[PDB]
Amino acid sequence: KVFGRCELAAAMKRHGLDNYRGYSLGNWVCAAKFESNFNTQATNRNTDGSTDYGILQINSRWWCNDGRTPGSRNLCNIPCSALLSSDITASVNCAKKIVSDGNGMNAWVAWRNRCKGTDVQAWIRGCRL
Template sequence: MRPSEPRALDRTFCPPKMTGALLVSLVSCLIAISQASLINRCDLARVLRKEDLDGFEGYSLNDWLCLAFVESNFNISKVNENADGSFDYGIFQINSHYWCNDYRSHSENICHEDCQDLLSPSLLSSIICAKKIVSGAGGMKNWVAWRLHCAGRPLSYWMTGCFLG
């Protein structure tokens, strides 16, 4: 074979069965990791109701569920970097420039929270901060995704099948 010709992959060190098993193991681990931070829609509704968000500042549980879905797809540990260098944290994607301190850039830290606390499975820090955001000017309109996908739309289906007892 001349040096300019591409060489076929040498599979002597990686038999096909081993490659398949490795791939299945890797995918299984990734699925387990990604699902570990998700919360079920109805479980989230129960938590939000327990924390008195149903009707808070005029917003129903349906509004809160829609917000959590469009912002994070119910991912409690989601972190997203924005074009301006700020980050959004947690199930409600709360921004580090205004609401929490991530110690990476200047923050007004209006909620007086470490951004990492917004990733807690208990959701308490996220809920307290979200209440502060909604209580201020603009309410849920502070979230662009809520304005685009939830505001003024029928949202009753978000509670379908959820028994809050």
Template sequence: MKAVWLLFFLACVLPMGQGKIYERCELAQKLKEMGLDGYAGYALDNWVCMAYHESRYNTAATHYNDYDGSTDFGIFQINSRYWCQYGSESSANICRTPCSALLTCNLAPDVACAKIVVTESADGMGAWVAWRAYCQGQDLSQYVAGCDL
């Protein structure tokens, strides 16, 4: 049994580990444990809604942006132009993390960077287009409904 847990742990923390598609309540629980409920004034349902519309809860999601050549990474689709470092691409790398760290099932780098984005951006969660389009000003109770939080 210890060997199974060790393998799972290593798969999650090593950069080459596989991503994970979370279930809604599973993600809500993890994000709550990691301190996002109420962070910067945003309730947990905002974070879960945003993650759904950005990546469909997929930690391995990427999206290339034709308009500026940047790429969005991970469950929160964090952008390589400003927040993370993607290879030798020019980046402000405000989160001081490689973008590849945002693609594993280990949510710690994603959450740490999301906390920086929401506090450093003048728009708060408005930094995420999907949050503005689908979550802002909406009843988001469905995103945590039925979850044992």
């Protein structure tokens, strides 16, 4: 599922991401835009042989099981395919653990490089939230 911008903002807010670990909703929306283009089905291979999955590009090296990332962890205790669902529950719940891991939203490289330090409230402008 490819979410609309305000559609995703509303879902992320419902699931408790607005201000989670002090990150305002626009940070999360911006991150999703640049990680996945708002597409739950996005997958991307990494150089270490892990893959990033879903709307927030969650990595199989640590967070989910995809059966082809030897020596990896599964800290969200989910198959990585769960992160591709049109239902973003699993992705959100797992993102909460990630952003609590120590480095905050710097875990999302597109957030770091394209959202951090920018006017991220623009990403929710016009949304009835």
